[PDB]
């Protein structure tokens, strides 16, 4: 009697705070943007990138040195303006929102042609994460209030919190890809690109860093968001001056200095680059028994799948 | 012909894959799957990955020609992923539900019962009840299923029962030794 | 092909309903209400079996070739099967 009641009382008392729910990060990008290589490097692997992308799943483990806690970091990704919410909604659940972070990768090749891709994916994530905080019917939402106040008091750490330029309730880091093309851009094009790259970071309060092979900052900064996988914050100064490397600590990039909105984007868009069938009929085809059976199969299988009454 | 069977697979991937077996025990006294949970997730994802990659390597008649005639079906039926992944998550939840059931079934922490018995037990009436309740819980343990199954996975539950049975006997031994010392102590007091 | 013929048959003023009973009283296709669909499938399943037995009892080397049962309300026809038969109901009037 009292033996199990107390045992129950202890597992009830405990349960607030192997490791506690591990974090995971999702990679917004395009298809064949080089982002697969970036992810695989975050896993500290040398494997050739996979062509396809359909919520690819991979993870790894880290230790601390006093022990091996087996800190697992999960990785999810999607590329291109394909099945936006149908797939974005899959790896993201409200129960783990506080443990969820985004990183957005942009191919420098054609920022304009890539902009609707990342924008659509980003909107899908933004809308989704905003809802799941209470869509689950989380009555005891105190945690929801706490975690939101954390996110919107991490970047305006010291600077007076004048306004939340865009309430964005999930961590975000932004980075380009294949900067090898940037050195070959026209001076005028590099400048207008810099305006938007600088702006978008401070707009979301998302840090920036470069991407290369010898560049350890990529692994480091990614590691921080990935459960300190490659160290700690190690906040450095903004590199808006050199423009050769890339690095921005969110909070030091005040608009008045880095930009010096709608008008900014419109201007950069116009200057940088403005030029931004299934045949179900099967008419040139014929068959008699093959098409008759296919019609039969279609009906019978479709009705069977409905009858399964799956809750999924 | 291929697209039809392709569509069929996409709807029932959570049902028709080869079964995976896992053993459930208490590693470090903590309820855990062997192999770990994150591991079987990765295997499950790889299994569906292999299927959906099929419409890429299909040497249909006239292999000298283009192959896109087939692989186009992937994009055209990309909507199927929603159902696949939704069912995948539901299956994972079902596995967790089994996990939790056993965690609630018997608490293994087993706090040190020495303090408890001293506080408010050895009351002759309630004290005997503690023996009876333990016997009753043992009888319940004797009915624990030896295995559980979901759509594509089997779970061995005997390691769980094994650990639990040990706990049952240990609790009994504590009760018996505790009463012995309690009664003897009373006798020492009056004898003094 | 078969679906088009069934529709054409159903369009006939004589036909009052068609049921495709597959797994021994379990239908998949019907042009009738649910209570009648289930009852009719069951009845004709049992009924045809009785006729087949009757024929074998008359001669141990012959099976059913066709079975018709008529009533004032409607008339029902069934055919022998290996795996499953089909049910048609018509108004003889």
UniProtKB/TrEMBL annotation, chain B:
This is Cytoplasmic dynein 2 heavy chain 1. It comes from Homo sapiens. The cytoplasmic dynein complex 2 is probably composed by a heavy chain DYNC2H1 homodimer and a number of DYNC2LI1 light intermediate chains. The chain holds residues 756 to 947 of 4307 of the full protein. Belongs to the dynein heavy chain family. Transmembrane segments: none annotated. It is found in: Cell membrane; Cytoplasm, Cytoskeleton, Cilium axoneme.
């Amino acid at each position: 009697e009292t033996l199990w009641e107390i045992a129950k009382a202890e597992v009830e008392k405990r349960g607030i705070n192997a490791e506690i729910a591990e974090k995971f990060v999702f990679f917004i990008g395009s298809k064949n943007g080089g982002k697969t290589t970036i992810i695989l490097r975050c896993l500290d692997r040398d494997e050739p990138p996979k062509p396809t992308l359909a919520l690819e799943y991979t993870y790894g483990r880290r230790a601390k040195g006093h022990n091996t806690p087996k800190d697992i970091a999960h990785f999810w990704e999607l590329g291109g303006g394909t099945s936006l919410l149908d797939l974005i909604s899959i790896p993201i659940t409200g129960d783990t929102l506080r443990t969820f972070s985004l990183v957005l990768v942009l191919d420098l090749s054609k920022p304009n042609d890539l902009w609707p891709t990342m924008e659509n994916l980003l909107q899908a994530t933004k809308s989704h994460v905003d809802k799941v905080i209470m869509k689950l019917g989380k009555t005891n939402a105190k945690a929801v209030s706490e975690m939101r106040q954390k996110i919107w008091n991490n970047m305006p750490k010291d600077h007076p919190d004048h306004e939340l330029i865009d309430p964005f309730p999930v961590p975000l880091v932004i980075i380009g890809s294949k900067y090898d093309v940037f050195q070959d851009f026209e001076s005028e094009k590099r400048k207008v690109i810099c305006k938007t790259l600088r702006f978008v970071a401070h707009y979301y309060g998302a840090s920036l860093m470069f991407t290369s092979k010898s560049e350890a900052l990529l692994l480091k900064i990614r590691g921080v968001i990935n459960q300190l996988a490659f160290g700690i914050d190690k906040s450095k100064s903004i590199c808006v001056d050199q423009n050769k490397p890339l690095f921005i600590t969110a909070g030091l990039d005040s608009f008045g200095q880095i930009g010096s909105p709608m008008e900014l984007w419109k201007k950069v868009y116009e200057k940088l680059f403005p030029p931004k069938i299934k045949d179900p009929a099967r008419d040139p085809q014929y068959a008699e028994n093959e098409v008759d059976e296919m019609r039969i199969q279609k009906d019978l299988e479709l009705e069977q799948y409905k009858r399964s009454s799956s809750k999924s | 012909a291929l697209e039809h069977q392709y569509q069929m697979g996409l709807e029932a991937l959570n049902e028709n894959l080869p079964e995976i077996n896992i053993d459930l025990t208490y590693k470090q006294g903590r309820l855990q799957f062997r192999p770990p949970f994150e591991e079987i997730r990765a295997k499950y994802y790889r299994e569906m990955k292999r299927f959906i990659g099929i419409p890429n390597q299909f040497k249909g008649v006239g292999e000298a020609g283009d192959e896109s005639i087939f692989s186009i079906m992937i994009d055209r039926n990309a909507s199927g992923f929603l159902t696949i992944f939704s069912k995948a998550e539901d299956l994972f939840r079902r596995l967790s539900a089994v996990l939790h059931q056993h965690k609630e079934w018997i608490v293994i922490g087993q706090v040190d019962m020495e303090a408890l018995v001293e506080k408010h037990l050895f009351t002759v009436h309630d004290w005997e009840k503690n023996f009876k309740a333990l016997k009753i819980k043992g009888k319940e343990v004797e009915r624990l299923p030896s295995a559980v199954k979901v759509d594509c996975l089997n779970i061995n539950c005997n390691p769980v029962k094994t650990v639990i049975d040990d706990l049952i006997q240990k609790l009994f031994d504590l009760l018996v030794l505790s009463l012995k010392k309690s009664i003897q102590a009373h006798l020492h007091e009056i004898d003094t | 092909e078969v679906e088009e013929t069934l529709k054409r048959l159903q369009s006939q003023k004589g036909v009052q309903g068609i049921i495709v009973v597959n797994t021994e009283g379990i239908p998949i296709k019907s042009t009738m209400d649910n209570p009648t669909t289930t009852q009719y499938a069951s009845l004709m399943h049992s009924f045809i079996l009785k006729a087949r037995s009757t024929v074998r009892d008359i001669d141990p080397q012959n099976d059913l070739t066709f079975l018709r049962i008529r009533s004032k309300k409607n008339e029902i026809m069934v055919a022998p099967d290996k795996d499953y038969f089909l049910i048609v109901i018509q108004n003889p009037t």
